[PDB]
Amino acid sequence: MQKKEIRRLRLKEWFKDKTLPPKEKSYLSQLMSGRASFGEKAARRIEQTYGMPEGYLDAEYAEQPGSS
Numbered sequence: 001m002q003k004k005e006i007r008r009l010r011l012k013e014w015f016k017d018k019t020l021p022p023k024e025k026s027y028l029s030q031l032m033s034g035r036a037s038f039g040e041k042a043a044r045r046i047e048q049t050y051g052m053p054e055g056y057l058d059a060e061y062a063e064q065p066g067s068s
Contacts, residue, residue, distance in 0.1 A: 003038060003058075003063065006058070006060045008033075008036070010057050010059065014050070014052070043057045
């Protein structure tokens, strides 16, 4: 499973032109870094403060068949 790969790629894209608070920056950086934990509501918890759509991070690309 490479769900974390999708979560990081989408996360850095949003923050490409935006910025994040230091309290989360320590954690957000981990996601972008590629090393982080995922499996719980955490994917949607992030969108709660940012106001992003539910399961935005979930939207996969590479995981899809035919894409590596």
